[PDB]
Tab-separated table of C-alpha atoms and ligand atoms in Angstrom:
chain	number	residue	atom	x	y	z
A	617	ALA	CA	47.041	96.770	212.062
A	618	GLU	CA	43.934	99.291	211.525
A	619	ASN	CA	43.064	101.099	208.269
A	620	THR	CA	42.091	97.839	206.047
A	621	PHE	CA	39.826	95.443	206.826
A	622	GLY	CA	39.149	91.984	205.216
A	623	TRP	CA	39.243	88.095	205.983
A	624	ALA	CA	41.862	86.135	206.616
A	625	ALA	CA	42.831	82.188	207.474
A	626	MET	CA	44.815	81.598	210.742
A	627	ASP	CA	45.472	77.650	210.049
A	628	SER	CA	46.204	75.019	207.490
A	629	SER	CA	42.347	74.584	208.083
A	630	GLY	CA	41.697	77.198	205.543
A	631	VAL	CA	38.588	78.760	207.517
A	632	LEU	CA	38.651	82.455	206.805
A	633	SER	CA	37.152	84.954	209.136
A	634	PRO	CA	37.314	88.710	210.182
A	635	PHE	CA	40.852	90.502	210.241
A	636	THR	CA	42.185	93.948	210.451
A	637	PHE	CA	45.602	95.129	208.933
A	638	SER	CA	47.179	98.272	207.661
A	639	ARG	CA	48.548	98.996	204.141
A	640	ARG	CA	51.184	101.420	203.328
A	641	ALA	CA	50.607	104.744	202.366
A	642	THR	CA	50.531	105.942	198.572
A	643	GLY	CA	54.009	105.829	197.377
A	644	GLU	CA	54.697	108.469	194.613
A	645	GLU	CA	54.165	105.675	191.989
A	646	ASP	CA	51.270	103.703	193.772
A	647	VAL	CA	47.453	103.376	192.984
A	648	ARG	CA	44.829	103.099	195.808
A	649	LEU	CA	41.705	101.282	194.841
A	650	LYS	CA	38.468	100.254	196.500
A	651	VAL	CA	38.044	96.985	196.027
A	652	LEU	CA	34.748	95.869	194.382
A	653	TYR	CA	34.869	92.528	193.385
A	654	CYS	CA	37.331	89.877	194.009
A	655	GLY	CA	37.392	86.382	192.142
A	656	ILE	CA	38.036	83.390	193.767
A	657	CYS	CA	40.994	80.770	192.578
A	658	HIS	CA	42.079	77.327	193.308
A	659	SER	CA	45.454	78.878	193.719
A	660	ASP	CA	43.647	80.919	196.893
A	661	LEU	CA	42.276	77.446	198.058
A	662	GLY	CA	45.604	75.725	197.877
A	663	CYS	CA	47.293	78.805	199.634
A	664	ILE	CA	44.593	78.598	202.563
A	665	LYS	CA	44.814	74.808	203.267
A	666	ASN	CA	48.929	75.106	202.828
A	667	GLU	CA	48.705	72.692	200.052
A	668	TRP	CA	52.519	73.207	199.050
A	669	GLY	CA	53.741	73.963	202.669
A	670	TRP	CA	55.161	77.443	202.247
A	671	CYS	CA	52.201	79.259	203.630
A	672	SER	CA	52.508	81.530	206.468
A	673	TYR	CA	49.366	83.094	208.427
A	674	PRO	CA	47.116	85.068	208.927
A	675	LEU	CA	46.734	84.960	205.404
A	676	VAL	CA	44.551	87.393	203.407
A	677	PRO	CA	43.687	85.565	199.933
A	678	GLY	CA	42.455	87.190	196.655
A	679	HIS	CA	44.219	88.263	193.574
A	680	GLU	CA	41.637	88.640	190.756
A	681	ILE	CA	40.852	92.104	192.142
A	682	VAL	CA	38.833	94.876	190.568
A	683	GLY	CA	37.864	98.296	191.847
A	684	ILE	CA	38.262	101.997	191.442
A	685	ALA	CA	41.173	104.139	191.972
A	686	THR	CA	40.882	106.431	195.103
A	687	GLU	CA	44.380	107.591	195.247
A	688	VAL	CA	47.482	108.419	192.702
A	689	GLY	CA	51.175	108.893	193.377
A	690	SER	CA	52.433	111.536	191.841
A	691	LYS	CA	54.653	110.058	189.550
A	692	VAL	CA	51.757	107.897	188.002
A	693	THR	CA	51.420	108.213	184.170
A	694	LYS	CA	48.754	105.680	183.190
A	695	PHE	CA	46.033	105.966	186.038
A	696	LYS	CA	44.030	108.764	187.629
A	697	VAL	CA	41.205	108.717	190.518
A	698	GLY	CA	37.910	107.113	189.309
A	699	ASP	CA	39.936	104.852	186.794
A	700	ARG	CA	38.636	101.374	186.828
A	701	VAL	CA	41.583	99.080	187.730
A	702	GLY	CA	42.561	95.394	188.114
A	703	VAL	CA	45.178	93.922	190.010
A	704	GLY	CA	46.289	90.326	189.593
A	705	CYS	CA	48.694	87.510	190.765
A	706	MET	CA	51.612	89.962	191.231
A	707	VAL	CA	52.493	93.254	193.055
A	708	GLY	CA	56.123	93.290	192.965
A	709	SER	CA	59.143	92.056	190.999
A	710	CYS	CA	62.969	92.240	190.789
A	711	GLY	CA	62.968	95.380	188.490
A	712	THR	CA	66.522	94.510	187.231
A	713	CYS	CA	66.101	90.612	186.194
A	714	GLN	CA	66.447	89.480	182.602
A	715	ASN	CA	62.698	88.598	183.127
A	716	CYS	CA	61.548	91.824	184.665
A	717	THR	CA	63.166	94.017	182.209
A	718	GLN	CA	61.120	91.911	179.116
A	719	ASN	CA	58.048	91.971	180.645
A	720	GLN	CA	58.186	88.608	181.789
A	721	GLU	CA	57.664	89.554	185.346
A	722	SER	CA	55.870	86.415	186.644
A	723	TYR	CA	59.473	84.798	186.809
A	724	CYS	CA	62.106	87.275	188.699
A	725	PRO	CA	62.844	84.877	191.309
A	726	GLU	CA	62.018	87.725	193.734
A	727	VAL	CA	58.542	87.624	192.366
A	728	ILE	CA	56.244	89.469	195.227
A	729	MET	CA	52.843	87.845	194.926
A	730	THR	CA	49.569	89.720	195.343
A	731	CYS	CA	48.678	87.275	198.084
A	732	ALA	CA	50.346	84.756	200.775
A	733	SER	CA	53.747	86.284	200.360
A	734	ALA	CA	56.256	89.122	201.275
A	735	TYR	CA	58.322	92.091	200.203
A	736	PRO	CA	62.433	92.234	200.571
A	737	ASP	CA	61.719	93.806	203.676
A	738	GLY	CA	59.635	91.466	205.364
A	739	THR	CA	56.283	93.012	205.248
A	740	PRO	CA	53.713	90.185	204.208
A	741	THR	CA	51.487	90.643	201.203
A	742	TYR	CA	47.656	90.791	202.045
A	743	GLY	CA	45.300	90.180	198.928
A	744	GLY	CA	41.922	91.192	197.481
A	745	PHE	CA	39.577	89.813	200.297
A	746	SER	CA	39.858	93.219	201.881
A	747	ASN	CA	38.216	96.574	201.424
A	748	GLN	CA	41.283	98.254	199.487
A	749	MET	CA	44.303	97.837	197.681
A	750	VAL	CA	47.411	99.551	197.030
A	751	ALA	CA	50.164	98.428	194.115
A	752	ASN	CA	52.678	100.001	191.987
A	753	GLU	CA	51.335	101.508	188.701
A	754	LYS	CA	53.550	99.095	186.985
A	755	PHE	CA	51.262	95.994	188.440
A	756	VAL	CA	47.700	97.452	187.615
A	757	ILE	CA	45.564	96.532	184.612
A	758	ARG	CA	42.835	99.317	183.004
A	759	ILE	CA	39.719	97.436	182.765
A	760	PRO	CA	38.182	98.639	179.687
A	761	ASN	CA	34.816	100.311	179.765
A	762	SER	CA	33.119	97.640	177.755
A	763	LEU	CA	33.416	95.002	180.060
A	764	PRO	CA	31.797	94.659	183.841
A	765	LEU	CA	33.918	94.593	186.817
A	766	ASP	CA	32.557	91.555	188.102
A	767	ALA	CA	32.871	89.442	184.935
A	768	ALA	CA	36.143	90.817	184.087
A	769	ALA	CA	37.944	90.238	187.572
A	770	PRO	CA	38.474	86.364	186.795
A	771	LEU	CA	40.055	87.226	183.610
A	772	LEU	CA	42.899	88.763	185.502
A	773	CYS	CA	44.065	85.206	186.318
A	774	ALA	CA	42.198	82.643	184.426
A	775	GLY	CA	42.122	84.905	181.599
A	776	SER	CA	45.718	85.991	181.468
A	777	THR	CA	46.744	82.373	181.933
A	778	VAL	CA	44.975	80.811	179.240
A	779	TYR	CA	46.010	83.581	176.756
A	780	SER	CA	49.571	83.672	177.654
A	781	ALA	CA	50.061	79.878	177.093
A	782	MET	CA	47.985	79.880	173.998
A	783	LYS	CA	50.493	82.855	172.937
A	784	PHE	CA	53.774	81.106	174.097
A	785	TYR	CA	53.054	77.828	172.572
A	786	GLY	CA	51.832	79.158	169.037
A	787	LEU	CA	48.313	77.747	169.577
A	788	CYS	CA	46.342	80.985	168.633
A	789	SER	CA	45.698	80.635	164.942
A	790	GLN	CA	42.507	80.071	162.855
A	791	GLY	CA	41.878	76.417	161.868
A	792	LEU	CA	44.256	74.896	164.539
A	793	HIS	CA	42.387	72.075	166.700
A	794	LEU	CA	42.408	73.047	170.372
A	795	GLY	CA	41.581	70.516	173.125
A	796	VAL	CA	40.471	71.765	176.637
A	797	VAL	CA	40.589	69.455	179.378
A	798	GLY	CA	38.547	70.297	182.508
A	799	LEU	CA	35.462	72.355	182.381
A	800	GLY	CA	35.904	74.443	185.729
A	801	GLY	CA	36.944	78.260	185.645
A	802	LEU	CA	40.338	77.948	183.729
A	803	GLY	CA	38.550	75.594	181.303
A	804	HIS	CA	35.424	77.818	180.372
A	805	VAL	CA	37.568	80.841	179.843
A	806	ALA	CA	40.191	78.565	177.807
A	807	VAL	CA	37.215	77.585	175.404
A	808	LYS	CA	35.965	81.279	174.814
A	809	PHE	CA	39.661	82.661	173.771
A	810	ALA	CA	40.160	79.686	171.717
A	811	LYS	CA	37.139	80.205	170.137
A	812	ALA	CA	37.847	84.030	169.576
A	813	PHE	CA	41.271	83.028	168.007
A	814	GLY	CA	39.142	80.699	165.630
A	815	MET	CA	40.187	77.372	166.633
A	816	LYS	CA	37.961	74.408	166.607
A	817	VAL	CA	37.830	73.316	170.536
A	818	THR	CA	36.790	69.736	171.605
A	819	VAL	CA	36.163	69.724	175.678
A	820	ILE	CA	37.481	66.576	177.284
A	821	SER	CA	35.830	65.856	180.522
A	822	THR	CA	34.671	63.339	183.356
A	823	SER	CA	31.216	64.986	184.076
A	824	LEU	CA	28.914	64.014	181.150
A	825	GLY	CA	26.336	66.274	182.644
A	826	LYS	CA	28.209	69.114	181.245
A	827	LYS	CA	28.735	68.434	177.557
A	828	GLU	CA	25.597	70.506	177.174
A	829	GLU	CA	27.327	73.894	178.729
A	830	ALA	CA	30.259	73.080	176.544
A	831	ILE	CA	28.404	72.583	173.107
A	832	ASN	CA	25.514	74.948	173.555
A	833	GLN	CA	26.366	77.812	176.221
A	834	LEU	CA	30.238	77.842	175.650
A	835	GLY	CA	30.198	76.963	171.670
A	836	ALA	CA	32.966	74.082	171.522
A	837	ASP	CA	32.531	72.001	168.583
A	838	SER	CA	33.422	68.679	170.072
A	839	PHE	CA	33.069	66.941	173.409
A	840	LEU	CA	34.960	63.736	174.721
A	841	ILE	CA	34.566	61.750	177.682
A	842	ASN	CA	38.310	61.287	179.388
A	843	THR	CA	37.638	57.494	180.293
A	844	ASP	CA	35.226	56.669	177.006
A	845	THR	CA	38.027	54.890	175.510
A	846	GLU	CA	35.863	54.000	172.346
A	847	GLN	CA	35.479	57.906	171.538
A	848	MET	CA	39.163	59.168	172.436
A	849	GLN	CA	40.326	56.501	170.375
A	850	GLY	CA	38.265	57.503	167.331
A	851	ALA	CA	40.026	61.209	168.257
A	852	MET	CA	43.557	59.992	167.901
A	853	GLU	CA	46.512	61.948	166.576
A	854	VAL	CA	43.845	64.979	165.781
A	855	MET	CA	44.690	67.983	167.892
A	856	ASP	CA	47.312	70.416	167.492
A	857	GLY	CA	47.644	71.159	171.130
A	858	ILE	CA	45.414	70.575	174.518
A	859	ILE	CA	45.294	73.110	177.371
A	860	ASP	CA	45.016	71.166	180.827
A	861	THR	CA	42.978	72.983	183.367
A	862	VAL	CA	42.582	70.141	186.012
A	863	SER	CA	44.305	70.667	189.236
A	864	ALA	CA	43.784	67.299	190.064
A	865	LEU	CA	45.629	64.137	189.497
A	866	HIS	CA	44.794	62.696	186.210
A	867	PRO	CA	46.122	60.532	183.827
A	868	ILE	CA	48.758	62.335	180.913
A	869	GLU	CA	48.733	59.373	178.292
A	870	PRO	CA	45.212	59.324	177.044
A	871	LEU	CA	45.708	63.110	176.469
A	872	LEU	CA	48.737	62.403	174.748
A	873	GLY	CA	47.129	60.040	172.333
A	874	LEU	CA	44.594	62.950	171.127
A	875	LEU	CA	47.903	64.932	170.063
A	876	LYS	CA	49.292	65.229	166.547
A	877	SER	CA	52.566	63.581	166.352
A	878	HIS	CA	55.614	65.589	165.537
A	879	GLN	CA	53.732	68.659	166.644
A	880	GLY	CA	51.054	67.889	169.163
A	881	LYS	CA	51.592	70.155	172.470
A	882	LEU	CA	50.063	69.253	175.843
A	883	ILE	CA	50.151	72.627	177.721
A	884	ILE	CA	49.389	72.250	181.410
A	885	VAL	CA	48.134	75.496	183.639
A	886	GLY	CA	46.293	73.355	186.595
A	887	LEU	CA	48.648	72.550	189.153
A	888	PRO	CA	47.412	69.430	191.390
A	889	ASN	CA	48.400	68.005	195.047
A	890	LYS	CA	50.398	65.193	193.280
A	891	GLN	CA	52.156	65.044	190.114
A	892	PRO	CA	51.720	62.312	187.435
A	893	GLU	CA	53.694	59.935	185.486
A	894	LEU	CA	55.695	61.611	182.652
A	895	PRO	CA	54.566	59.327	179.657
A	896	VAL	CA	58.353	58.961	178.431
A	897	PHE	CA	57.470	56.593	175.557
A	898	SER	CA	54.333	58.448	173.977
A	899	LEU	CA	56.588	61.437	173.997
A	900	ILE	CA	59.511	59.815	172.190
A	901	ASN	CA	57.424	57.783	169.580
A	902	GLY	CA	55.087	60.633	168.755
A	903	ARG	CA	57.770	63.227	169.023
A	904	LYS	CA	55.199	64.807	171.348
A	905	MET	CA	56.149	67.725	174.222
A	906	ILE	CA	54.494	69.036	177.390
A	907	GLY	CA	55.187	72.291	178.640
A	908	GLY	CA	53.674	74.614	181.486
A	909	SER	CA	52.236	77.852	181.578
A	910	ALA	CA	51.778	80.304	184.339
A	911	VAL	CA	49.780	83.651	184.500
A	912	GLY	CA	51.384	86.113	182.111
A	913	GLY	CA	53.002	89.604	182.604
A	914	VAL	CA	51.390	92.583	183.233
A	915	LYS	CA	51.604	93.936	179.503
A	916	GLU	CA	50.546	90.593	178.340
A	917	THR	CA	47.820	90.845	181.078
A	918	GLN	CA	46.747	93.973	179.743
A	919	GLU	CA	46.926	92.735	176.263
A	920	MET	CA	44.544	89.860	177.534
A	921	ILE	CA	42.008	92.419	178.852
A	922	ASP	CA	42.114	94.582	175.834
A	923	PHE	CA	41.639	91.292	173.590
A	924	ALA	CA	38.669	89.944	175.853
A	925	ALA	CA	37.042	93.350	175.404
A	926	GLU	CA	37.245	93.593	171.713
A	927	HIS	CA	35.838	90.036	171.486
A	928	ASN	CA	33.206	90.628	174.446
A	929	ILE	CA	34.915	87.896	176.527
A	930	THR	CA	33.672	87.508	180.398
A	931	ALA	CA	33.664	84.990	182.856
A	932	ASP	CA	30.762	82.924	183.936
A	933	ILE	CA	30.455	83.941	187.451
A	934	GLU	CA	28.678	83.597	190.560
A	935	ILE	CA	28.738	86.624	192.950
A	936	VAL	CA	28.509	85.963	196.362
A	937	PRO	CA	28.810	87.883	199.825
A	938	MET	CA	31.940	87.723	201.813
A	939	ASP	CA	30.685	85.522	204.807
A	940	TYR	CA	30.154	82.639	202.038
A	941	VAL	CA	33.649	82.470	201.208
A	942	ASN	CA	34.174	79.585	203.293
A	943	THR	CA	31.368	77.788	201.820
A	944	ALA	CA	32.532	78.972	198.208
A	945	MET	CA	35.765	77.037	199.080
A	946	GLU	CA	34.318	73.871	199.966
A	947	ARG	CA	32.494	74.240	196.805
A	948	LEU	CA	35.675	74.973	194.662
A	949	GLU	CA	36.922	71.803	196.247
A	950	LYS	CA	34.276	69.756	194.195
A	951	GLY	CA	34.194	71.471	191.418
A	952	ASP	CA	30.682	72.871	192.040
A	953	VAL	CA	30.803	76.113	190.105
A	954	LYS	CA	29.508	77.415	186.953
A	955	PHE	CA	32.161	78.668	186.662
A	956	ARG	CA	34.149	81.160	188.609
A	957	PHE	CA	33.254	82.528	192.082
A	958	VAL	CA	33.667	86.465	192.577
A	959	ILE	CA	32.865	88.272	195.807
A	960	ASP	CA	31.161	91.161	195.851
A	961	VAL	CA	33.734	92.948	198.264
A	962	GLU	CA	31.842	96.432	198.224
A	963	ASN	CA	28.417	95.690	199.076
A	964	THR	CA	29.126	92.711	201.444
A	965	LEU	CA	32.319	93.108	203.308
A	966	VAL	CA	32.004	95.158	206.486
A	967	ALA	CA	34.122	96.284	209.421
A	968	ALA	CA	33.397	94.212	212.549
B	541	ZN	ZN1	43.557	82.689	190.359
């Protein structure tokens, strides 16, 4: 309870305040980094307000971490002091599963999340709303020189997720017609990756005063209003797949109507509070599918970030200081951001 400082929630109220704690010494396989930036994710919002009821306190959120290695263990092969490194959703895993062994490490039942979790021996994991971070080399990402740290930080989670989903479900080929539902953090990262894979992108939305970022800033080929039951119906059976990034309850059936029969896939990556109805009749009669995806494993996250570098993909961010974080959270509940918050941890997190 000393050698590291950050901000933490104590309550399901999710209100965050200064908090001091200790990180482990750097083991033979560990990298320590000074945290320079930490993205804010809807997962952090859910965790601090204990949306799903598992979370215990004090809770230091943050899992979109970028920084500079300050210390490497002797057994470390990938990294040296000074490297630009990242840490995403995970800091640990089983190490011996079927999942852990074929780089699907986001599915060992003993996965150790970067924030709001604990190791086997009971010690709680504190995320990147803090001045420094320690992680096994195995969960550390190299940030390419040609991407800025602040705008790469959110790729560690939003980017890994959309890329892993597009790869896994076979929606990463030129010409394919991809729909993206929601135009928040994930939504805009999804559009950038889809355009870089060569797919025609239609954004599906509820905010018509966002068409303009969708078409012009983000470069999407088409724009649809969720409820515009007349334009939607003109877009029926058109799309090879849809990535749904909305973390709010919303109707699934109209999205299914946009999908190609005996082909189209609705891939869900936003996790809401309540669950919608399963459109059994549409799935059966159109021979359509719904699959879910979460963040990809560490190799796939490295591959994602190298792909983003090759294609100059960056998240569209708003830099904020640490003591704005509570306001930032309130703004996330509203979608009021373009598109992702990033905390400037180095310049604005200070010791109490
Ligand atoms: Zn996230």
